[PDB]
Amino acid sequence: SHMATLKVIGVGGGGNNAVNRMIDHGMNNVEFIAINTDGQALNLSKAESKIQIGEKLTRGLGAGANPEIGKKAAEESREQIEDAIQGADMVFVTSGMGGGTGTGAAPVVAKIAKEMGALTVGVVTRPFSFEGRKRQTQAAAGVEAMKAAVDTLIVIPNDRLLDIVDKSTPMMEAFKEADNVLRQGVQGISDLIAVSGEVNLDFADVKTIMSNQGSALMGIGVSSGENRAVEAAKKAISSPLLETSIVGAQGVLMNITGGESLSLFEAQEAADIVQDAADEDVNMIFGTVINPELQDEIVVTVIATGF
Ligand SMILES: Nc1nc2c(ncn2[C@@H]2O[C@H](COP(=O)(O)OP(=O)(O)O)[C@@H](O)[C@H]2O)c(=O)[nH]1
Ligand SMILES: [K+]
């Protein structure tokens, strides 16, 4: 009966990069919106919906690292941003904090989306330490503004990308690894909404776990063979890229997809991995999907909140 309208919105350079790479990767049933002050970057966006903000302010340039320009640009294009969001049931706002457009404009976009009734998730990066202390301080203020404007917020410190590269990894490949946090969180929700589960979870459970919560973790894990349930759950909660780990979570939506071999015992093992790692008494919302096209693969999806 109900089919949730999901929109992913990139705000600023880094956010629009993410959107372009997610669109290249292929993702259906999601509307993408690109928002920027910088008209040069926007002309190259792959998104179906493009909103140039603050053209009277910047004359079509970026914000020159000034968050106040990004914020005033978003406020002045409020109506345009509302028109783009209208109809959304859920909005993901992604941006790199520390510059001028994303720092300043991404919390305004998030606010508008929450004010229109949408479940609003932010997925933002913090700058590398090598970008300097001022960039980090501006980013921190952006992160705080984002937290005040979203239902849930996922922060990716870009320094963590230095933990997963070797000395030759291309920068673009490291950036794709961070893109995965948003992409797989969105796909997980889209999949949860679209399939009926044998123990069914739907968009109302997502709203319950995510609405007005603060920090979150969104993770997916796939494994096969022996101990697949424990291994997939461990993968779902363990990302080296997250500021907010699973430790401390007090609400968890956990969906397990498997073939007809999916055992009750391994569903409990998987739930216990999450609960034990949270180190809290977790209020779990537990789902199960039987996909017979799967043989030996099991997929664990986790959304964690209540920190
Ligand atoms: N992970 C990642 N970080 C980015 C990317 N682009 C920019 N950043 C980071 O985002 C911050 C803000 O840059 P940018 O989004 O281009 O600035 P803005 O357009 O003024 O908001 C930078 O300081 C970098 O830390 C990207 O594609 N991926
Ligand atoms: K469902």
From Swiss-Prot:
Q: Which family is this protein grouped under?
A: Belongs to the FtsZ family.
Q: Which residues of the full protein are shown?
A: 12 to 315 of 390
The superkingdom listed in its UniProt entry is Bacteria
GO terms under biological process? division septum assembly; FtsZ-dependent cytokinesis; protein polymerization
Keyword Amino-acid biosynthesis appears in the UniProt entry: no
Major subcellular site: cytoplasm
Q: Which GO terms describe its cellular component?
A: cell division site; cytoplasm
Q: Describe its partners and assembly state.
A: Homodimer. Polymerizes to form a dynamic ring structure in a strictly GTP-dependent manner. Interacts directly with several other division proteins. Interacts with FtsA.
> Which molecular-function annotation in GO is an example for this chain?
GTPase activity
> Does the record bear GTP-binding in its keywords?
yes
Native species: Staphylococcus aureus
Primary gene name: ftsZ
Where does it reside? Answer: Cytoplasm
Coiled-coil zones: none
**Keyword annotations of the record:** Cell cycle, Cell division, Cytoplasm, GTP-binding, Nucleotide-binding, Septation
Q: Which residues bind GTP?
A: G13, G14, G15, N16, N17, G100, T101, G102, E131, R135, D179
What this protein is reported to do is described as: Essential cell division protein that forms a contractile ring structure (Z ring) at the future cell division site. The regulation of the ring assembly controls the timing and the location of cell division. One of the functions of the FtsZ ring is to recruit other cell division proteins to the septum to produce a new cell wall between the dividing cells. Binds GTP and shows GTPase activity.
Q: What is this protein called?
A: Cell division protein FtsZ
